Design a protein around this ligand. Structure first.
Ligand SMILES: Nc1ncnc2c1ncn2[C@@H]1O[C@H](COP(=O)(O)OP(=O)(O)O)[C@@H](O)[C@H]1O
Lengths: 78, 83
């Protein structure tokens, strides 16, 4: 009558982490810095676009003025 | 053509130390069989339910699988029981 039976106990392997808290924090800090740099680039790019738009009008005005002056001088000369 | 099956086992008896395992191994090696499985009777017993039967059952798995795969063109497997 040496017929034995058993029961079982369970253990849980550690969840997936303990490497997600050293590279993670550095990743977040770098992401924040990149976000700030992107915001600054946004602002600078908008300012540059405004300045180019401003330049356009003066360019067109000088072109028109020179063309009209040349035509007038030619007309009077002949 | 005759339709005759092969003998399935033999028994060897005599005084100890007279060369029975030698003869068994030589018979196995001569027929181009695979490496034999040598077992000892007293070492199979266990004190849990369903453990000795598992040990007895585990020796035929390779032959079963090989026959299920290759059908009638399989090799020859040998099992040796001591004591
Ligand atoms: N007929 C024999 N010729 C040569 N050596 C033998 C012979 N019988 C036994 N021996 C020697 O005895 C050893 C042990 O024999 P063994 O095979 O253990 O016998 P048994 O199975 O009867 O216990 C062998 O390895 C071998 O060295």
């Amino acid at each position: 009558d040496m017929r034995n039976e058993l029961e079982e106990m369970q253990r849980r392997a550690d969840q997936l982490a303990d490497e997600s808290l050293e590279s993670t924090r550095r990743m977040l800090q770098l992401v924040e810095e990149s976000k700030d740099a992107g915001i600054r680039t946004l602002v600078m790019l908008d300012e540059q676009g405004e300045q180019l738009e401003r330049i356009e009008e003066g360019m067109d005005q000088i072109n028109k003025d020179m063309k009209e002056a040349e035509k007038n001088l030619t007309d009077l000369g002949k | 053509q005759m339709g005759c099956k092969h003998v399935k086992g033999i028994l060897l008896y005599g005084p100890p130390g007279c060369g029975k395992t030698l003869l068994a191994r030589q018979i196995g090696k001569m027929l181009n069989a695979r490496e034999p499985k040598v077992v000892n009777g007293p070492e199979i017993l266990n004190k849990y339910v369903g453990e000795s039967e598992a040990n007895i059952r585990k020796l035929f798995a390779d032959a079963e699988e090989e026959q299920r795969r290759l059908g009638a063109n399989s090799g020859l497997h040998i099992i040796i029981f001591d004591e």
